[PDB]
Design a protein around this ligand. Structure first.
Ligand SMILES: NCc1ccc(-c2ncc(OCC3CCNCC3)nc2-c2ccc(-c3ccoc3)cc2)cc1
Length: 164
C-alpha cells in the first residue's frame, strides 16, 4: 500500500504580474506526495474546489489519498481522459475562450508555486479544436491547474479543451 498524502501549496488565483511567454482541507492547489524509504516524493499536483479533489489518473493511479487525519476516497475517474475525482463528481466545468492568454499555476516538485502567463497552441481534432500548453516543468508538475483571466480552472497541466 503506497502512502499518498496531500500538501496545500498555495491559493488558486490569477496573478497580474505573473511572468510571460517562454523562459520555462479548504480549497487551493495541493501537491500529491508518496511516502518512500528514500524520502517523500511529489508525483502530481491537484486542485481542491467545492470539497472535491481533482488530479490526473496517472498521478493517483486510483490509490486512496491521505489528507490530515482523514482518508480521501475517489468518487469518479476517466482513464482515457487521464482525470480522477476524489470525494465528489468533477466540479471543474470552466472552459477556455480559445482566443486569450492563460496562466498556469505551476507547482514543480521542490519549488515554490509560480504563475506563468502563456498562450496555448491551437490544433484541430475530430471532437473539437483543442488548446495545447507545453512546457519544460518536471513530471511531478502534472495536474497543475490552468486558469483564464477570470481565475477559473480551464485545465490541468498535462490537453486544454477549447469551447467558445
Ligand atoms: N496525460 C496527458 C493527457 C492529455 C490529454 C489526454 C486526452 N486524450 C484524448 C482525449 O480525447 C477527447 C475525448 C473527449 C470525450 N469524448 C471522447 C474524446 N482527451 C484528453 C484530455 C482532455 C481534457 C483533459 C483535461 C485536463 C483538465 O481538465 C480536462 C485531459 C485529457 C489524455 C492524457
Amino acid at each position: 500500500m503506497a502512502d499518498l498524502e496531500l500538501e496545500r501549496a498555495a491559493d488558486v488565483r490569477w496573478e497580474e504580474q505573473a511572468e510571460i511567454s517562454g523562459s520555462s482541507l479548504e480549497d487551493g492547489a495541493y501537491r500529491i506526495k508518496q511516502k518512500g524509504i528514500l524520502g517523500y516524493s511529489q508525483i502530481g499536483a491537484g486542485v481542491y474546489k467545492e470539497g472535491t479533489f481533482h488530479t490526473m489518473w496517472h498521478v493517483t493511479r486510483g490509490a486512496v489519498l491521505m489528507h490530515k487525519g482523514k482518508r480521501i476516497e475517489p468518487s469518479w475517474a476517466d482513464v482515457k481522459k487521464d482525470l480522477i475525482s476524489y470525494g465528489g463528481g468533477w466540479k471543474l466545468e470552466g472552459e477556455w475562450k480559445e482566443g486569450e492568454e492563460v496562466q498556469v499555476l505551476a507547482l514543480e516538485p521542490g519549488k515554490n508555486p509560480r504563475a506563468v502567463q502563456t498562450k496555448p497552441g491551437l490544433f484541430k481534432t475530430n471532437t473539437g479544436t483543442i488548446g495545447a500548453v507545453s512546457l519544460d516543468f518536471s513530471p511531478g508538475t502534472s495536474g497543475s491547474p490552468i486558469v483564464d483571466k477570470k481565475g477559473k480552472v480551464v485545465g490541468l497541466y498535462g490537453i486544454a479543451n477549447t469551447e467558445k
